Amino acid sequence: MVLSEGEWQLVLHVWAKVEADVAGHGQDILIRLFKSHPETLEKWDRFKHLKTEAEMKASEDLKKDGVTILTALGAILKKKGHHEAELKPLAQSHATKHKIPIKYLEFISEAIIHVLHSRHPGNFGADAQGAMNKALELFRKDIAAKYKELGYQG
Numbered sequence: 001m002v003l004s005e006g007e008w009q010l011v012l013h014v015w016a017k018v019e020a021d022v023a024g025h026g027q028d029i030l031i032r033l034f035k036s037h038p039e040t041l042e043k044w045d046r047f048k049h050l051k052t053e054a055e056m057k058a059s060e061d062l063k064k065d066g067v068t069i070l071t072a073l074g075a076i077l078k079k080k081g082h083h084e085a086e087l088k089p090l091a092q093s094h095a096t097k098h099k100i101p102i103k104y105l106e107f108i109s110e111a112i113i114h115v116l117h118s119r120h121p122g123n124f125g126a127d128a129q130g131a132m133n134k135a136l137e138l139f140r141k142d143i144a145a146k147y148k149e150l151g152y153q154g
């Protein structure tokens with residue numbers, strides 16, 4: 001699968017808005033993930049104990065991790081599919097150390113789409129959401145291929 005330049009531009013134009021406040025977007029996205037799919041919270045040993053959205057919002061560590069995730073994802077998106085180098089360490093750590101199944105990457109992709117849809121109707125209309133879905137699907141497809149190479153089913 002291959003995105004068009006027009007599709008990448010739709011992806012990068014909403015990402016420019018995320019970057020006005022990556023910390024805030026990261027909090028919203030992780031909270032959405034943890035609330036919609038509470039099982040995902042178990043993979044974070046710093047966070048598996050968090051009981052409420054208020055606790056999640058107050059966690060400086062969660063905020064930091066949200067910035068780390070979205071900044072790594074942003075760097076991937078800006079490669080416009082040419083992300084082999086970026087995917088290598090990410091696939092290795094997530095397959096082998098953190099043990100994050102592909103299904104959970106699907107869950108966080110859902111959270112990203114949901115938050116962007118809510119925050120950015122000006123840059124996340126139907127065409128832009130389609131483009132972002134395509135970009136995240138490409139990311140997951142390529143990560144899943146790497147998981148397999150690394151010896152993890154995902």
Ligand code: HEM
Pocket residue numbers: 040041043044045046068069070072073089090093094098100104105108
């Ligand atoms: C867009 C998808 C994601 C991206 C771009 C991303 C990125 C990152 C990065 C850059 C790190 C730090 C370096 C590393 O260990 O590789 C990290 C760590 C980590 N990630 Fe992910 N991540 C994603 C999804 C997830 C999901 C869905 C989970 C769990 C449900 C998860 C769990 C973790 C954990 C437990 C760590 C280690 C945290 C720590 O040591 O404090 N990640 N991630």
